Write a protein that binds this ligand. Sequence first.
Ligand code: ADP
Ligand code: ADP
Ligand code: MG
Ligand code: MG
Ligand code: MG
Ligand code: MG
Lengths: 263, 263
Amino acid sequence: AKMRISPELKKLIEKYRCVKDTEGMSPAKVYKLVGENENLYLKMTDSRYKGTTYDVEREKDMMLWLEGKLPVPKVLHFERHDGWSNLLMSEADGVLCSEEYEDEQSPEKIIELYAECIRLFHSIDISDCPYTNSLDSRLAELDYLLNNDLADVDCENWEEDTPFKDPRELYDFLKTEKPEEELVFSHGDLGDSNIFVKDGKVSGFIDLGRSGRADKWYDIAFCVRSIREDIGEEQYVELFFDLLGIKPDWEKIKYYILLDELF
Amino acid sequence: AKMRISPELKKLIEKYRCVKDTEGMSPAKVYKLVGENENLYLKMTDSRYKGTTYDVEREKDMMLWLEGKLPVPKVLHFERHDGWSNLLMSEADGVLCSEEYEDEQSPEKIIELYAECIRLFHSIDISDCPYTNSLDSRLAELDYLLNNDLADVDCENWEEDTPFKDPRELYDFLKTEKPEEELVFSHGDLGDSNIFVKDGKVSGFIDLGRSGRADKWYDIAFCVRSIREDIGEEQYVELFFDLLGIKPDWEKIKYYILLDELF
Ligand SMILES: Nc1ncnc2c1ncn2[C@@H]1O[C@H](COP(=O)(O)OP(=O)(O)O)[C@@H](O)[C@H]1O
Ligand SMILES: Nc1ncnc2c1ncn2[C@@H]1O[C@H](COP(=O)(O)OP(=O)(O)O)[C@@H](O)[C@H]1O
Ligand SMILES: [Mg+2]
Ligand SMILES: [Mg+2]
Ligand SMILES: [Mg+2]
Ligand SMILES: [Mg+2]
């Protein structure tokens, strides 16, 4: 009788061939359900992450609210079952960006894509957005994650050259250097593994747990980080800002990139 | 202050560049520590798995006990820190079995390797083996894992054509159909990901959490499973037994393969 999914959800997915996603970049369990005529995806998060930006329930609320606003998968079924938040969704439309630009010398293409994403985001009306992921909320969550050992451990943070010696040290800095915020729609984890492209245009967004209201520099900083991680040429960072048509605010960019090292 | 590893351990791995292992087949956190002189491996399991066959402390004990008996990595450092069990070990010698066979069709070489491991395991004197992984012990921990929702993430267990409707039904079956046991040294998870080869002969064994005393058919069953899903041809299973010089006991083989489903 003890199961992580309900009998109702089990019936909906029995006909599919379960292939667990190998990435495992988050505490969530992700499953591709290979069917005869389509694939579905089931994302699950345990009770320890209930209410946090990692909670897939969060992720369903944003998916529903984002329908008609951004290209997102369809919510086929959601439920809370024995502490688990279970989200059954349709397969995103298009090609995963990390795949589309995998072995391809064209950093400029993903830059153009990021620019496009930031553009689309700034057009989204957040007046009735389900979640506000301002720094007060994010830091309170981070505090909880740290205290309960639920924050992700970037094993690279153990290397001797890392600035902050421990998670709290970084947290105290984030708490102290909290920049001013101007809320706009924020994806929360604008990476090439969460974005889909079809015919040059963005075709889908997933991993929406941190989606909601947040400063504009949050997603922008994420992009700066991605640009630098893939290529050691800072010229592409300037290209990105040329495309956005704005001046980089390095203090805010550094801040949000730092905030991410605990997520 | 609060960290998953102690300052002593942190100090020991500072000089190393961390590269987290992407497999993530178990609840253990595995990290490759790349250095200029050599590479080390850091394996970690949290508080919830304490005392179970997943606990790296148990794995460390077996790693220590197997020195001079089987080619295993050297225990460089062990500690219990803030609920975590951490093990710093040397890199195994040789080539990963799944890598040496990567694509190159050489089934009989793998069959001979598996055969070699079984014969090698049977020559091991278990008179002072630290652990006895009898079925009572294994089922007892399985009961605990299920009671705390720590048993293997149901993915295929959700599919329609699965024999057991739920984990408990499977557990109950194992409890009732528990066969007789003849304890020999058992690796606990004999597979191409936990075995290393050099010059066609086994050069290293890792993932020792479930190692100790257990029935001989346990590891043999795992090889049968590996042969079928890695090689494909059933003739190679017959060959496996030819090399072992024994006739397969399918009733026991099915049982042990079934035992690992929930782990
Ligand atoms: N609805 C979906 N459509 C297509 N691919 C998906 C879908 N959901 C998940 N995936 C795939 O699985 C990976 C992990 O999903 P994601 O929601 O990003 O989980 P996490 O928060 O761990 O990153 C994604 O990078 C993508 O490859
Ligand atoms: N000491 C080691 N030397 C070399 N590779 C190792 C070592 N420890 C772990 N690995 C690598 O990391 C993978 C996961 O480690 P393992 O101990 O098997 O963890 P788990 O129990 O999750 O399978 C192994 O398949 C192997 O590729
Ligand atoms: Mg993601
Ligand atoms: Mg995510
Ligand atoms: Mg292993
Ligand atoms: Mg293991």
